[PDB]
Every structure is written in structure tokens, then in C-alpha cells.
Amino acid sequence: EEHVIIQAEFYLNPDQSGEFMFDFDGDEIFHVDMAKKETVWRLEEFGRFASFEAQGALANIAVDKANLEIMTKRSNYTPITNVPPEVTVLTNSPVELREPNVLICFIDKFTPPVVNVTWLRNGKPVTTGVSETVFLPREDHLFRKFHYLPFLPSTEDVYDCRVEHWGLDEPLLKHWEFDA
């Protein structure tokens, strides 16, 4: 093989949430804001080379919901079995004191696609500069997701990626501190 373009979408009850997105060899090309009804590209540049009638995705999402009701009903309302996320925290590039870097919280292999993620600096939550991606498909039909935190490497600092998910008995905290 060489390349794969996936049009992955989903509807989920009872959260009444949905997703519609395209994917190139594991990376998100774009996804549609279910609310604002507009294509948002993973990278700014893409929006300058191609387009997508975002409005049309919602039509698929209506059909998706209906189908969900149908499957839910014929499966004798068999609910999804929660599968907890494997969490890992890495840097974008090899860390070096005061040399700007980014914290990547790799939340993977989980489902349903609903999760609460929080970044922590010395026991306290960080908001400034944080960015996250939508849910990404996996061959095993579970999901992957990434959260990001830009930071200035130090020795004193201790970070955490706090992940909440029904499949976890308790909030998972992933410890990360400068060890180089």
C-alpha cells in the first residue's frame, strides 16, 4: 500500500455529539464544526489549496443519527463497552533548557469518543497556548487524540496531563518534568 484517505464520521447517544472529518495517512486534513457549520483545516495552508462544502456534512450526520437509533434498537439497546485511554506525554522536539518546546499529550486507544483533558503546572491548570485535535479513527475502531501545551523548559517545573474517561476508575495524571 501507499496512502489512505479516510472519511470518518460518528454520532453518539446520549451525548448527542457528532464528528465528520477526512484523514490522510493518519493525519487529519480537516473536520467540520458541527455547530458553526464550517470546514476547519488541521493546517491553515490546506484551506488555501482546497475547499469543502462544510454544510453538507450535517446531512450525513442526520442520517448517521437515524441509523444509530436503528442499530441501538435492533441490538436490544446494547451499550458501548468503555475502553480506557493509554496516555503518553512527549515533547515535540528534544528538550533543552529555556529552548522553547511543546508538550504533546497522546491520548490513544479509547472509546466512546468523549474525554476531559487538562494540563497542569505545579499542581495548577494551564490554559494559555493550549490547543487540541478532534477524535481520530483507528483500525480497531477505538480513537486517538492529541492535546498541546507550548512551554519554556525549566528544571523546577512539573507538568501533568489530566485525562478523564468513563473507562478509567479515576482521573489519570501523566507526570512530565525535565530529566535531561
Binding site: 479516510i6 495517512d25 451499550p79 522536539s93
Partner: protein, 187 residues
């Protein structure tokens, strides 16, 4: 708290491309919770139930020729079309890896670390050499890491018993570069 059961529905249209846009296979799959119920493999030509739960749909949709006709042609109208739509910033996108070599903060023996980061495409090749000749044994990698931002990275260590004058080279070959990127470590 929130303990209500969840019910999911996923739909994936998979366009697989072999040798550019030469041969193409479209895999349409329906998934109930974490189970694929129905699917359409362009190589098969019609819907096939993956579980009894999906039997009704495979039979139903297959009874609609207009539909089946549209699906069969999707390898062209859909797959090939979309491939070309973004071939410039996806298939052709290239970002050179940032390569650096340094001893690990672990390890007698010295554990060398070859850090290759921020590269795209994901396909890459990194091998160690000792005085101009490959290092089959001793190597240990972290694996290809998909940073999620269209950027990859990977660590590839080498276990060595350093002797003055030895030159341990980390060679990297990647689509972004014609001739390989090399980084030596003088012992």
C-alpha cells in the same frame, strides 16, 4: 455523576491507493459500538454483512442498483478525485528531519541516541554504522511517532563499547532529502 450507557455509530469510507492513483480500493464500513456490522469492499462489488446485525442492510442496499452503481464508481468519482484534490499538500508534502546525536542519560557501555524529529512523510530509515559498516546488532528504537500535527519523530539508540578513534555514524534517509543525512559521534 453521568452513568448513562452510550450507543455509538461510526461510518468510515476508506480510499486505499497503491502505486499512486493506479490501483484503488474503496472500503465502506459501518460500525455499531466497537463492531463493524456491514461493509462494501469495492474489490468485492457489493455489500457484505460482517455480523448478523448487519445482514438486513447488506441485503437491502444490494437490492438498489442505482446505489450499487454509484458505489462501484466511487473509486473514481470519490477516491481518485479526492486524491488529486490534495495531492500537492499531502502526497507531495515534505519536511526535512532535524537530526542530532548525543549519549543517553542512562547506560562499561555508552548508549548513543540518534534523535530524528519533525519530519514528514512518516516513512523514514535510520541505521547506525561503525567505521563505515552497518550495526545490525545492538540497535533499539522507540518506533515511529505520529505527533498529530503532520509531523513525526523517533529515537534510535545504539549500544556501544567505545574505543578512542571509533566513529559511530547515524544515517538517515528520507523523502525530503536526495542524499542521506549523516551525524557522527567521535569516540
Amino acid at each position: 455523576g453521568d452513568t448513562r450507557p452510550r450507543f455509538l455509530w461510526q461510518l468510515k469510507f476508506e480510499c486505499h491507493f497503491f502505486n499512486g492513483t493506479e490501483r484503488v480500493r474503496l472500503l465502506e464500513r459501518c460500525i455499531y459500538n466497537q463492531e463493524e456490522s456491514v461493509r462494501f469492499d469495492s474489490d468485492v462489488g457489493e455489500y457484505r454483512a460482517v455480523t448478523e446485525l448487519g445482514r438486513p442492510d447488506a441485503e437491502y442496499w444490494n437490492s438498489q442498483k442505482d446505489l450499487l452503481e454509484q458505489r462501484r464508481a466511487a473509486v473514481d468519482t470519490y477516491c481518485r478525485h479526492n486524491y488529486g484534490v490534495g495531492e500537492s499538500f499531502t502526497v507531495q508534502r515534505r519536511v526535512e528531519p532535524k537530526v542530532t546525536v548525543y549519549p543517553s542519560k542512562t547506560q562499561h557501555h555508552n548508549l548513543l541516541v540518534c534523535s530524528v524529529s519533525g519530519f514528514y512523510p512518516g516513512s523514514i530509515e535510520v541505521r547506525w554504522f561503525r567505521n563505515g559498516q552497518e550495526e545490525k546488532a545492538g540497535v533499539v528504537s522507540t518506533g515511529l511517532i505520529q505527533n498529530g500535527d503532520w509531523t513525526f519523530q523517533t529515537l534510535v539508540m545504539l549500544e556501544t563499547v567505545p574505543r578512542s578513534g571509533e566513529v559511530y555514524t547515524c544515517q538517515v534517509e528520507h523523502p525530503s532529502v536526495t542524499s542521506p543525512l549523516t551525524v557522527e559521534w567521535r569516540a
